C-alpha cells in the first residue's frame, strides 16, 4: 500500500 506520507 502507500507509505504514511504518500498521496
Amino acid at each position, epitope marked *: *500500500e*502507500n*507509505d*504514511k*506520507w*504518500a498521496s
Partner: antibody
Amino acid sequence: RITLKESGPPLVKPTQTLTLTCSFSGFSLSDFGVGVGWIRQPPGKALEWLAIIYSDDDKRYSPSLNTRLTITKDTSKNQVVLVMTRVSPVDTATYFCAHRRGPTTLFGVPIARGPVNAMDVWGQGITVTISS
Amino acid sequence: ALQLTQSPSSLSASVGDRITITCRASQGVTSALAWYRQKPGSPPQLLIYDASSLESGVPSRFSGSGSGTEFTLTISTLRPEDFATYYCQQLHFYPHTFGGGTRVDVRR
C-alpha cells in the same frame, strides 16, 4: 542530538523467540509523525527492511515476515521493541533500529513532507546469531 | 513487490574520481528515495533524502538527482572514506525497500 542503541541476546536457538529493544534519546515517540523502524543485515548481505512504528501508533511490517513480527512502543521509556518468533538460522544478522523524521511543521502546521523520505539516524546495530 | 535495482553492483575507482551510482524502481516512487553510505563495521549513514536533498552535515561532494523510476547518486571527488558500499531506499510503498547495494573499492 539523536542517538539510538539496540540491545537483546547475541545468541538465540532455532524455534525460539527473539526480543530486541531500541532505546533512544533526542526525540520522543510522542513527537508529531515521528517513526522508529528496524532493518537487518545478514553477514555479507544487503539491508532488509523489517518494520516501523509511528508516534500515532500505526504499525507496518515486511510482508515476508509479517506472521513472526510484533513491533511495539513504550513512549515513557523511550523504547521500541521488536519481537520475532520462531527464529531459524537464516535470521542470523546484524539488527539496526533507526529514526524517521515526521513532516516539518510551522506554528504546528505541517508544511514539508520531504524530510520523512529517509531513515536519518541509525543505531550501531546488534549482532544476533541463531544456532542450536 | 516493488523492485529496486542498483547499478553497478560493484565499481572500482581512485581518490579524486567522479562516480555515479544509479537505482531504478519497478514502479514510480515519486521523490521518496534515500541514499546511504555504509562503511565496513558501521551502520548505514544518510547522505541524501527525498531524492535530492543534502542531509545536514553531509559533505557537498555528494549529490542526488532523479524522480519516478530512475535515480542517481554522484560523488564528484571521491575521498578515501568513500570506499564503501552504497544503498538506495524507497519510502513511497510498504515495504520500504532497499536496493542490493553497490560496493566501491580501490581500483588497481
